Enzyme design. Structure first.
Site, PDB file in Angstrom:
ATOM      1  N   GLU A 257       0.822  -1.202   0.000  1.00 32.98           N
ATOM      2  CA  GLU A 257       0.000   0.000   0.000  1.00 32.98           C
ATOM      3  C   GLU A 257       0.857   1.254   0.000  1.00 32.98           C
ATOM      4  O   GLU A 257       0.449   2.293   0.515  1.00 32.98           O
ATOM      5  CB  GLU A 257      -0.947   0.009   1.205  1.00 32.98           C
ATOM      6  CG  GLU A 257      -2.025  -1.066   1.172  1.00 32.98           C
ATOM      7  CD  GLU A 257      -2.893  -1.066   2.418  1.00 32.98           C
ATOM      8  OE1 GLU A 257      -2.545  -0.359   3.387  1.00 32.98           O
ATOM      9  OE2 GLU A 257      -3.924  -1.774   2.427  1.00 32.98           O
ATOM     10  N   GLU A 333      -5.278  -9.718  -0.761  1.00 32.19           N
ATOM     11  CA  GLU A 333      -6.345  -9.988   0.192  1.00 32.19           C
ATOM     12  C   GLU A 333      -7.678 -10.264  -0.496  1.00 32.19           C
ATOM     13  O   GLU A 333      -7.934  -9.768  -1.591  1.00 32.19           O
ATOM     14  CB  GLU A 333      -6.488  -8.816   1.162  1.00 32.19           C
ATOM     15  CG  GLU A 333      -5.190  -8.068   1.411  1.00 32.19           C
ATOM     16  CD  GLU A 333      -5.418  -6.664   1.928  1.00 32.19           C
ATOM     17  OE1 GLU A 333      -6.581  -6.210   1.941  1.00 32.19           O
ATOM     18  OE2 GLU A 333      -4.429  -6.013   2.324  1.00 32.19           O
TER      19      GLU A 333
END
Lengths: 410, 205
Positions: A257, A333
């Site tokens: 991220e 994810e």
């Protein structure tokens, strides 16, 4: 939590000792015979007489022994390395490490005198596996890999950040028990002990460089800037040397991220060159970034795709199909486990079996994050968000847990 | 889209006529002759060597010839499962978007899956879809929904534009459409032949 959450120890080294050693595996297409070569670098003073011996021991019986004089290979162009020795050991019909079976070998690196006494001894667990991406399909040991994985955050409610040795074993059993062969730690290097457990126990491990930059706007700015590269480098560079040896790790992840920055592209190149053994995947930049060998869209939806300008997200079936795309895709994810979660979970898995290219994705997240709090009665109640009053508190969203912390199964 | 006049549905294995070296000269004329006559027209965007002829060595040789004589138009061949080397663009026929059914040596996958296959880059256009026979085109929306969704999928030709029927005369002399071997030609596949989106006369289904 800021403090010392990890063990402090004192280490003693002989004046002449091997600072670093590397273990590498080569296999025939048949895989019947595998060649293993280890490179050892020795600190400080160098003696012509001193020799390094590598012994490979499986179970209680050794398979192969390697002994070499210091220095090797006459590397171009000025000189051969003074302090580096490369030892090659040939193993035939070697057992191959796999999530179902550890199949471990034990390798001992010993530096000894000519007569000779041995100054120091080093032992590294060795698993023989070959991980490569072939034809856009991630392959382990010549077999296409379907990865079922749960992101692991190393957290304990009673002890907070520090993890009891027992907890890892308890955590490891549950994931293995639950049909999980692959574990990913997001997004920092796990305890040094943790990698060792996976290698014995079974499941694949994906190392992650400890870089995140969710906060910065644009998020890519910290990673992107040229100046920040040295700070960025240490986390990726330092991590590889420490965790390179372990048989279990099948992947290297530069950042989570952090967005897409020039540094990631430079960093990605470095990992490949220093180590060619493991595929490198980076989530940031939309996961379509050049740096990542395998696409890792996060929270991607199989049926439908939602696009945010400059960060388009498509259904996984669609994403592989994109023009000029060959990379195998693994989700960082999926199936968020918070509160009631995993709905439509079947759909994701149904897709994974359906498509050869899709390797499956790690579930988020293995353990709900909560901290014990004491009532005036002193009964312990789990706390979500900034119960303590730290602010602003994201509160509930933090736990994100497949299984209770204590831990119990959701 | 021009199509070479070669079909070999009957032969078992079907590929045998196309596959054989001897048959190549006969095979060549249909592909070779067709290109010269129809090459000029602006409208044609594609060349198709054969339909349902299976995969034969000749198709591979023929495909090479069309490219060399003419580089202007992409060449697509259905046969061999549509994954054949000869076809520039994959043309699975009657492929199902949601689900895939595989026949040994001729696997068929959902179109979304088929592009996704390892080492596949070709744009995919269906030779046929949404069979129009009798009541037909059910789940038609689903196919089109997929086409818009995926950049690679170029969509596919519907089958078929005109139901095939032959006028027959009653003792009264009224004309009744005939399906299959009404005339008694045998064996007659009968009804399946019409396969029509719109009535022959023609009226719209």
């Amino acid at each position: 939590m800021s403090g010392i959450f990890r063990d402090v120890s004192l280490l003693h080294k002989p004046t002449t000792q091997i600072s670093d050693f590397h273990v590498a595996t080569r296999f025939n297409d048949d895989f019947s015979r595998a060649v293993l070569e280890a490179e050892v670098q020795m600190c400080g003073e160098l003696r012509d007489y001193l020799r390094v011996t590598v012994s490979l021991w499986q179970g209680e019986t050794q398979v192969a022994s390697g002994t070499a004089p210091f220095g090797g290979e006459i590397i171009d162009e000025r000189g051969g390395y003074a302090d580096r020795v490369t030892l090659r050991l040939n193993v035939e019909n070697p057992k191959l490490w796999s999530a179902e079976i550890p199949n471990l070998y034990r390798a001992v690196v010993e530096l000894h005198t000519a007569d000779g006494t041995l100054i120091e001894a080093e032992a590294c667990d060795v698993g023989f596996r070959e991980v490569r991406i072939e034809n856009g399909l991630l392959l382990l040991n010549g077999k296409p890999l379907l990865i079922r994985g749960v992101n692991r955050h190393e957290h304990h409610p009673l002890h907070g950040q520090v993890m009891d040795e027992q907890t890892m074993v308890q955590d490891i059993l549950l994931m293995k028990q639950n049909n999980f062969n692959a574990v990913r730690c997001s997004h920092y290097p796990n305890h040094p002990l943790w990698y060792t457990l996976c290698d014995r126990y079974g499941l694949y491990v994906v190392d992650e460089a400890n870089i995140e930059t969710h906060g910065m706007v644009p998020m890519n700015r910290l990673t992107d800037d040229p100046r920040w590269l040295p700070a960025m480098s240490e986390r990726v560079t330092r991590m590889v040397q420490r965790d390179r040896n372990h048989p279990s790790v099948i992947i290297w992840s530069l950042g989570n991220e952090s967005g897409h920055g020039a540094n990631h592209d430079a960093l990605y190149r470095w990992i490949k060159s220093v180590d060619p053994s493991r595929p490198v995947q980076y989530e940031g930049g939309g996961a379509d970034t050049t740096a990542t060998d395998i696409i890792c869209p996060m929270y991607a939806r199989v049926d439908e795709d939602q696009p945010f300008p400059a960060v388009p997200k498509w259904s996984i079936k669609k994403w592989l199909s994109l023009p000029g795309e060959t990379r195998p895709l693994i989700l960082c994810e999926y199936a968020h486990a918070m509160g009631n979660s995993l709905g439509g979970f079947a759909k994701y898995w149904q897709a994974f079996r359906q498509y050869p290219r899709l390797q499956g994705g790690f579930v988020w997240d293995w353990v709900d994050q909560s901290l014990i709090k004491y009532d005036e009665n002193g009964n312990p109640w789990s706390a979500y968000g900034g119960d303590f009053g730290d602010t602003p508190n994201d509160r509930q969203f933090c736990m994100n847990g497949l299984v209770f912390a204590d831990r119990t199964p959701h």
